[PDB]
Design a protein around this ligand. Structure first.
Ligand SMILES: Clc1cccc2[nH]cnc12
Ligand SMILES: Clc1cccc2[nH]cnc12
Ligand SMILES: [Cl-]
Length: 163
C-alpha cells in the first residue's frame, strides 16, 4: 500500500500517467474506441488481447508488466438512469478488486461514463462519488486524470472537501 493513501487529480493525458497501473474507460468489445480508450489503445495496444468484458465489470490485461484494467462503464444513451447508475457503481467496485489483487501502490483512473457514454449529461459528481465509494477502502494512491480545466477545479474541490 501507499504510506499515506491519497487522492489527486491531474489535467493531462492518462497515457502519460506516473502510476503503477492504468484504468481504461473501455468498451465491452475490446475495440480501440474513442477518447481515453483510443489513447490507451495507442499507448498499450498489447493490453487489448481478449480485453472484451461486460458492462459493469473490469478485466486486467498486462502490457509487458504494466497492468491495464479495462473498466466498462454503461453508455447512458442505452441504459435508464437507474440501471446505468447501478452498472457505473459496479464497474468501479470491480476496479477496486483489481487494484487490490494487483498489489499496486498507485493507479491512474479516468471518470467512467463522463465522455461519449454520458448520454449528453454532466456526470462528474455521479461518477466521482462512485469512484470514491469503491476506492476509499483501498490503500493505493489514486490519481484521477481529466481533460477540462473546470472539471480539474471541481474534482480538486471534492477531494480537498473530505480531507
Ligand atoms: Cl489528451 C489530453 C488530456 C488532458 C489535457 C490535454 N491537453 C491536450 N491534450 C490533452
Ligand atoms: C482524458 C480525458 C479525455 C481524453 C483523454 N485522452 C487521454 N486522456 C484523456
Ligand atoms: Cl465515456
Amino acid at each position: 500500500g501507499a504510506m499515506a493513501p491519497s487522492y489527486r487529480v491531474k489535467r493531462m493525458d492518462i497515457a502519460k500517467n506516473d502510476e503503477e497501473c492504468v484504468v481504461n474507460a473501455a468498451n465491452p468489445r475490446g475495440l480501440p474506441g474513442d477518447g481515453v480508450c483510443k489513447a490507451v489503445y495507442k499507448k498499450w495496444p498489447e493490453s487489448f488481447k481478449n480485453s472484451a468484458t461486460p458492462v459493469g465489470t473490469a478485466k486486467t490485461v498486462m502490457c509487458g508488466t504494466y497492468p491495464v484494467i479495462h473498466a466498462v462503464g454503461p453508455n447512458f444513451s442505452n441504459y435508464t438512469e437507474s440501471e446505468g447508475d447501478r452498472e457505473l457503481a459496479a464497474a468501479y467496485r470491480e476496479v477496486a478488486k483489481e487494484v487490490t489483487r494487483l498489489g499496486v501502490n498507485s493507479v491512474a483512473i479516468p471518470l467512467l461514463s463522463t465522455g461519449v457514454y454520458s448520454g449528453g449529461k454532466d456526470r462528474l459528481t455521479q461518477s466521482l462519488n462512485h469512484l470514491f465509494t469503491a476506492m476509499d477502502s483501498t490503500d493505493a494512491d489514486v490519481v484521477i486524470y481529466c481533460r477540462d480545466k473546470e472539471w480539474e477545479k471541481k474534482i480538486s474541490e471534492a477531494i480537498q472537501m473530505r480531507t
